[PDB]
Amino acid sequence: YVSFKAPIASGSDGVTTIYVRYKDNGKVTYQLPIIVSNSQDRDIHIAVDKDTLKTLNIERFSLYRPELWYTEMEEDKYEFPETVHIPAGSCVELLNIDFNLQDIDMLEKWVLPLTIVDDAKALLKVVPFNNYSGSYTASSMKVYTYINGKPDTNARTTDKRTGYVVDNNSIFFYAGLINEDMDKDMRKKYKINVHFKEDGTLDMKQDDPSNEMEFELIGTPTYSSTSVMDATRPYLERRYVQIMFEYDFQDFTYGGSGTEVIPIKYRVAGSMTLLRNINTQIPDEDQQIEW
Amino acid sequence: VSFKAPIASGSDGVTTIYVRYKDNGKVTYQLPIIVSVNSQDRDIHIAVDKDTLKTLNIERFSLYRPELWYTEMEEDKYEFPETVHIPAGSCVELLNIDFNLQDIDMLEKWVLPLTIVDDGSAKALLKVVPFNNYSGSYTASSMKVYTYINGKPDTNARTTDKRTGYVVDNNSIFFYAGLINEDMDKDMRKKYKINVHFKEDGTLDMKQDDPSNEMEFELIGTPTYSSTSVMDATRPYLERRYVQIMFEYDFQDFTYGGSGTEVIPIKYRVAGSMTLLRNINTQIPDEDQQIEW
Amino acid sequence: QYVSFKAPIASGSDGVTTIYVRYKDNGKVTYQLPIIVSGSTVNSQDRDIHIAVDKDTLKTLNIERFSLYRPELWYTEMEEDKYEFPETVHIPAGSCVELLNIDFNLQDIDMLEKWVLPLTIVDDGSAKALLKVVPFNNYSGSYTASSMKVYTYINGKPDTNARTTDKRTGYVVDNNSIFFYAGLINEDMDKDMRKKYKINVHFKEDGTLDMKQDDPSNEMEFELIGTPTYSSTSVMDATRPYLERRYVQIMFEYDFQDFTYGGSGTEVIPIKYRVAGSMTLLRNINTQIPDEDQQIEW
């Protein structure tokens, strides 16, 4: 039996998360092993399986929740050999998936659905990353509601916010506590592009040119990058990226679509910190990351 | 041959239609019956499609979430002609759906499932949403819900972004007390209805719907409301009409444990305001056609 | 005639029937499940009804209700070592009711799982029962947690703003010990992650509590603050004078860390919390019924 074997096992839906680094013009290669679980010179044929991904979306999220659906990766963003040759004697070969991630919209949950048509499926959730992207701890980020023109004393918080890749040193967030799984046409309006500068200051500007959420940065946001060695595991390095910011924005889409509502102005203030666990015994900058 | 409602259907195939509650709740909804030149005198037969609605409820919500299900509108609350004649040449005709909405329980998500059984040679799942000048989705960001801890309301308050005000009659609506989930078990949910009546003198009447008042609703002070209108800066013909209600009350959540089992009620102090916005396109003389939903 | 099962309460929206069994001396307790012969005529046959465990009906329910993509919400088939019941039940000619004696051995049962005993009548000697076995003691059930404040550690000190929920479930461990999930940890989260936040609460005679984390390595960095206490009080209902309301209030304060909020896999910065306040359990007792189990109004 000929199948695929990713470094980590798939989730409850059969989707495997793969982490690819965004580098120089975002050209990066992922190596997916193909296993024969051999006295034959086998030419294995691989193809994009659009249909398995559609069936999974229906089965998991249903036709009634398309905002939660995985999106098939665009043909212009990837390339892989149609045929993989495993000579007689070998039982393992690698499928080199070459990605071109430049200008990828991380609004979508990109999946590359692969299948062995001639000797088994692989639903690869392609997650680009840089030194500033991932799941930030947002417990010190306070979101105050404007009540009678002034921010209220009572603050709302969440445990984490995702920083999505834009390029090699820029990421984006969804403003305040905006639901990261809300209607895609509506959530793209709350993107905040955050660029990491050499002097330790950040650039924070809304993605929406018309700035319908009326994003307004307060003061000069900053970031600090520090590293601690683990006590228990002495070769493990914990790398922290703390971002400190303050801004105002408005939720003008909470009523659902179509409906024009009274915007709810919010004051977002505090910090968020990203952790990256690195196994400094592994010299490769990508293989050393412990996801 | 198909149907054409003013707004396109949602993610489930259900089209929301807005019908004004008026004089004893008798209102007619004129629903276009489009053709996509018609050289035939066609007699298009319309029927209630109970089965498409049942299939949708199962497919979207499942048999295990009936509290989320759409309810087929009661036969006593609507009437429409079985046959719609579109003469040769016409290509577009209006189906007259006559509703009798008096004493409609807006606890239910009413749907009128229609189908074309004969085109005289297409479905419409109409979610009937009655409205008055005071119903819709109210902004509830200035509404604070305090939990009673050791007999006194706590300092920490909980808020939500919106609450729905459902039609009762022409000048009365209802809300679900505090932050009670508007999609919870229907038998439980109905116990938390607050009837809000808008008087001319600018004051309100707020009383629980439950005669036995099991949620121990107690109005504090006198609830008032303000109704104002502003003309838009950008679009000069657009009129923004605001209705703000100002209230304070106490109630108890005695259903959070599910059903059957008896729990310690959680008393809450609800205090603040809620505001409803209605966008009206002046230059359109009809009071229902000017609304931009 | 139709042969079926008849539990004291009717089944839920899913079709699972909740049965309450008391945790006693080494947790050995018997549940009596009646088997009924319904029909217009009198049973003139000596019927030998055959009962079996129906693994498949439970699997079908789990998939139909929660789907294959939410296994953390799934019911778990009860372990064969925790129950015993006769394979055959004899209803003699004349009778239409007999009882299936289900003998449970609940010692060391992990209440992390929603245990279901799926039963079926394979032969009526000429109907399914999905029993959700819920062990209970005098301290287990759904506690009101509105006075339980959870403060987030911001810059090494607990924040002024507190988060609360309406209820927390106290699950049976033994006859006088229960467990909770620390702070506001989701009781329906990934089970492998969920089990790490168990707090074993033991009710002592002097009115004090023992609160220790179940995880031997204490990865959640649980730290009890001061001495937690409990008070047990009773009020008689005004309207129904034989009804007794039993309250068990537990007063505690502790610190813990949520180190699993990111999902599984990638290691996150733990969020330290200060949990402080009280929780109260209500139990309604019908004093006219002398039996300690039959008197409880669930």
According to DSSP, the β-strands at C47-53 and C97-105 are unpaired
Contact: A290, C267; criterion CB under 8 Å: yes
Judged by CB atoms closer than 8 Å, whether chains meet at A145 and B157 is answered as no
Task: Say if A148 is an interface residue toward chain B (CB within 8 Å).
Answer: yes
Looking at the complex, report in whole angstroms how far the Cα of residue B211 sits from the nearest Cα belonging to chain A: 32
Instruction: Please report which residue ranges of B134-290 form alpha helices under DSSP H.
Output: 186-189
Task: Report how far Cα C191 is from the mean position of its chain's Cα atoms.
Answer: 15
- Residue C288 DSSP one-character state: T
d(CA B1, CA B46) in angstroms, rounded, equals: 11
Q: Mind giving me the DSSP string for B144-184?
A: EEEEEETTEEEEEEE--SEEEEEESSSSEEEEESTT--TTS
Give the experimental resolution in Å.
2.8
Per CB-CB distance under 8 Å, the chain C contacts of A139 are 152-154, 271
**H or E segment at C64?**
helix C55-65
Please answer yes or no on whether A139 and C155 come within 8 Å at the CB atom: no
Query: What's the rounded Cα separation, in Å, for the pair C81 and A156?
Result: 48
CB contact (8 A) between residue A277 and residue C268: no
Residues facing residue B109 across a β-bridge = B70
CA diameter of chain A:
78
Which among A152, A155, A130 is positioned nearest to A141, based on CA atoms? Answer: A155
* The pair of three-digit structure tokens given for residue A253, joined into one six-digit string: 């889409």
Pull the structure tokens for residue A75. 């043909």
Chains with 3 or more CB pairs closer than 8 angstroms to B? A, C
CB-based contact B266:B253 (threshold 8 Å): yes
- In this structure, which long-range contacts are made by residues C265-271, counting pairs with CB atoms below 8 Å and at least 24 apart in sequence? C265/A8, C265/A291, C266/A134, C266/A135, C266/A277, C266/A290, C266/A291, C267/A275, C267/A277, C267/A290, C268/A135, C268/A137, C268/A160, C268/A275, C269/A137, C269/A240, C269/A273, C269/A275, C270/C221, C271/A137, C271/A139, C271/A159, C271/C152, C271/C153
Phi and psi of B186, rounded to 5°? -55, -40
Cα–Cα distance, C69 to C90 (Å, whole number) = 42
CA distance A95 to A86: 11
Choose from A139, A239, A278, A291 for mutation: most chain C CBs within 10 A: A139
Q: Tell me which method was used to determine the 3D structure.
A: X-ray
Cβ atoms within 10 Å, residue C186 = 13
CA distance A153 to C85: 60
Amino acid at A54: K
Q: Across the beta sheet with C97-105, what order do the strands follow?
A: C2-5, C28-38, C97-105, C83-84
Task: Classify strands B123-131 and B14-20 as parallel, antiparallel or unpaired.
Answer: parallel
Question: A50: which 2 tokens?
Answer: 């659009």
Domains of chain C: 1-138 (2.60.40.1740), 139-298 (2.40.128.440)
Nearest to B278 by CA among B74, B93, B132: B132
From residue A105, give the alpha-carbon distance in Å to each of A128, A257, C214.
11, 22, 44
On the 0-12 / 13-18 / 19+ scale of CB atoms within 10 A, B212 is exposed
Contact B191, B214 (CB under 8 A): yes
H or E stretch at B45: strand B42-48
Query: Is the CB of residue C203 less than 8 Å from the CB of residue C174?
Result: no
Nearest alpha-carbon partner for B4 in B120, B106, B102, B84 = B84
Task: Enter the tokens of residue C195.
Answer: 């089990």
Q: Which residues of C touch B147 (CB under 8 A)?
A: 146, 164
Does residue A233 sit at the C interface (CB-CB below 8 Å)?
Answer: no
Other beta carbons within 10 angstroms of residue C272's beta carbon come to 20
Furthest C-alpha separation in chain B:
77
- The Cα B175–Cα B189 span in angstroms is 11
Q: After which residues is chain A broken (C to N over 2.5 A)?
A: 37, 119
Determine contact, residues C102/C82, Cβ cutoff 8 Å. Answer: no
Judging by beta carbons within 10 Å of its beta carbon (0-12, 13-18, 19+), is residue B192 exposed, middle or buried? Answer: buried
C268, A135: Cβ pair inside 8 Å? Answer: yes
Residue B19 corresponds to which tokens in the numbers above? Answer: 């019908």
CA distance B33 to B44: 9
Q: Check chain B for breaks (C–N over 2.5 Å) and list the residue before each, or none.
A: 36, 121
For residues B291 and B18, the answer to whether their CB atoms sit within 8 Å is: yes
Asked if C267 is an interface residue toward chain A (Cβ–Cβ < 8 A), one would say yes
